[PDB]
Amino acid sequence: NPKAFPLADAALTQQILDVVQQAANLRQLKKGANEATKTLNRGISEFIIMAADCEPIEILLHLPLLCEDKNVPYVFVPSRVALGRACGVSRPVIAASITTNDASAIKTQIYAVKDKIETLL
């Protein structure tokens, strides 16, 4: 399906999920479609991760509009349950937003993943 167009391969998924857990730990990550849209509106998002097997896909498919409107990288990953593990919560998550903060330890990681996402876009 080309609706979830940029879908990460195994390696890029690894690094994406790793930086997602890092940001969840330093608490630079907003979890959920609604809060992600909120960060997107406020323009505080470094980039967006989405699930690719949502039931159905449109409920989060709304996001790429705002993403590529405001020039914020976005990427799909295979499994929402994997994304939930990566975030560190008890329930499957479908879309999360890595926010932006200059005083972060994971700066260089987020920038590497965002680099590769942009290349893939």
Which residues of this chain interact with another protein, rule CB under 8 A?
1-4, 7, 9-11, 13-14, 17-18, 21, 34, 52-62, 78-79, 81-82, 84-85, 89-92, 105
CA distance 120 to 114: 10
8 A C-beta contact, residue 15 and residue 9 = no
CA distance 72 to 114: 9
**In the complex, least distance from residue 67 CB atom to another protein, rounded to whole angstroms:** 14
Cβ distance to another protein smaller for residue 70 or 91: 91
CA distance 47 to 49: 7
Cβ distance to another protein smaller for residue 58 or 102: 58
**In the complex, least distance from residue 119 CB atom to another protein, rounded to whole angstroms:** 17
**In the complex, least distance from residue 99 CB atom to another protein, rounded to whole angstroms:** 20
CA dihedral for 88, 77, 75, 55, sign (positive or negative): negative
Structure tokens at 93: 């998550």
Query: Could you give the 3-state DSSP secondary structure of residue 109?
Result: helix
**In the complex, least distance from residue 110 CB atom to another protein, rounded to whole angstroms:** 16
Cβ distance to another protein smaller for residue 4 or 96: 4
